[PDB]
Amino acid sequence: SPGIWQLDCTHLEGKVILVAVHVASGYIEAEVIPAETGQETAYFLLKLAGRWPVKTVHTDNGSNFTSTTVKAACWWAGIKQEDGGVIESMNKELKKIIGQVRDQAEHLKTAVQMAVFIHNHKRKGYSAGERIVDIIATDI
Amino acid sequence: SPGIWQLDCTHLEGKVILVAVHVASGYIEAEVIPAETGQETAYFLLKLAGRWPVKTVHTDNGSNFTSTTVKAACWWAGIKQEDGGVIESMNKELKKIIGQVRDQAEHLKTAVQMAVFIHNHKRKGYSAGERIVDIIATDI
Ligand SMILES: Cc1cn2c(C)c([C@H](OC(C)(C)C)C(=O)O)c(N3CCC(C)(C)CC3)c(-c3ccc(OCCc4ccc(F)cc4)cc3)c2n1
Numbered sequence: 001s002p003g004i005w006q007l008d009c010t011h012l013e014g015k016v017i018l019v020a021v022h023v024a025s026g027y028i029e030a031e032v033i034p035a036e037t038g039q040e041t042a043y044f045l046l047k048l049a050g051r052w053p054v055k056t057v058h059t060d061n062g063s064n065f066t067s068t069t070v071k072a073a074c075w076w077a078g079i080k081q082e083d084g085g086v087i088e089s090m091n092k093e094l095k096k097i098i099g100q101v102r103d104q105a106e107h108l109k110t111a112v113q114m115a116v117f118i119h120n121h122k123r124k125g126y127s128a129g130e131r132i133v134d135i136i137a138t139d140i
Numbered sequence: 141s142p143g144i145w146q147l148d149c150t151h152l153e154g155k156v157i158l159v160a161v162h163v164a165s166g167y168i169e170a171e172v173i174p175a176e177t178g179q180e181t182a183y184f185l186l187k188l189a190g191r192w193p194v195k196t197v198h199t200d201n202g203s204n205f206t207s208t209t210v211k212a213a214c215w216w217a218g219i220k221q222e223d224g225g226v227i228e229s230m231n232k233e234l235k236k237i238i239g240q241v242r243d244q245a246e247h248l249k250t251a252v253q254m255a256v257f258i259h260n261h262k263r264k265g266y267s268a269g270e271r272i273v274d275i276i277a278t279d280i
């Protein structure tokens with residue numbers, strides 16, 4: 001459970017938001033990209049694995065599961081690349097937060113990082129940021 | 141101590157590498173940018189604070205300390221913006237790792253994230269990644 005993450009992809013303003021969800025805590029990392037490609041997904045996973053102890057990733061679709069570039073990043077970072085409700089509600093929640101801050105940000109990427117901040121600090125009482133740290137520290 | 145970070149800027153291949161160091165653990169986050177600007181620093185701090193509980197940031201120089209854009213990001217994210225050896229040795233260590241992986245990466249940003257991965261997982265026995273999680277979980 002502590003090393004399991006789920007990839008998720010959603011569209012907004014003609015752009016793609018790639019999200020990594022830490023399944024046990026609900027903690028997220030997200031980035032805005034022009035379109036989902038194997039190279040963008042591979043780079044996102046390399047970043048995530050250098051920051052958190054990523055053991056397994058459930059890919060968001062069969063193209064990212066199949067991608068030789070994604071498989072190479074998973075090999076490099078020591079990640080077990082795996083296949084495939086609450087994710088749909090999290091995409092809706094993220095878009096809701098983005099809408100609420102959209103006026104404070106000129107760039108979509110700024111609004112997305114503001115939403116990541118709000119989601120991870122929301123007490124619902126522990127926050128997702130507190131839960132991920134507690135889950136991983138117990139495993140050490 | 142658990143919420144204290146230090147910004148650091150270094151040059152490589154006509155580009156700038158912006159680094160955030162968690163002082164107590166030695167854990168790092170890094171990004172490649174064309175040049176250090178208030179907007180790039182503000183965006184980097186917004187990302188960092190959505191991922192880790194950032195209480196204080198020691199800015200890397202007086203321009204980032206003065207920047208109204210950096211001060212706005214610190215205000216938004218609830219960060220106390222503060223002023224100003226081992227950092228010089230960490231820039232040298234990071235460049236050394238980048239040199240060792242440079243042949244496996246076409247893009248400089250790929251090599252930088254590989255170096256972040258290696259630095260954070262290096263056991264020296266706990267790693268910086270284990271130390272940051274343990275330090276923050278004790279504070280919760
Ligand atoms: C020119 C330009 C572009 N520009 C742009 C592009 C942005 C944003 O992009 C990045 C993140 C900088 C790339 C954006 O996408 O909108 C920006 N932001 C600053 C940081 C933020 C508050 C997290 C989001 C808004 C400012 C700005 C700079 C000074 C501001 O000062 C407000 C009074 C004040 C309050 C508290 C303080 F402590 C100090 C000042 C406000 C907005 C800006 N300015």
Ligand SMILES: Cc1cn2c(C)c([C@H](OC(C)(C)C)C(=O)O)c(N3CCC(C)(C)CC3)c(-c3ccc(OCCc4ccc(F)cc4)cc3)c2n1
Nearest residue numbers: 039042043046068069071072073075076244245246247250
């Ligand atoms: C066309 C192109 C650009 N391109 C580029 C730009 C890159 C790198 O950029 C990003 C990170 C993708 C934007 C780069 O900056 O170099 C890249 N990398 C993949 C991930 C990495 C191993 C973390 C770094 C190298 C590959 C590639 C793709 C398949 C590879 O397969 C190697 C046999 C194999 C081993 C284990 C496996 F499980 C599966 C395959 C090797 C390299 C690539 N390809």
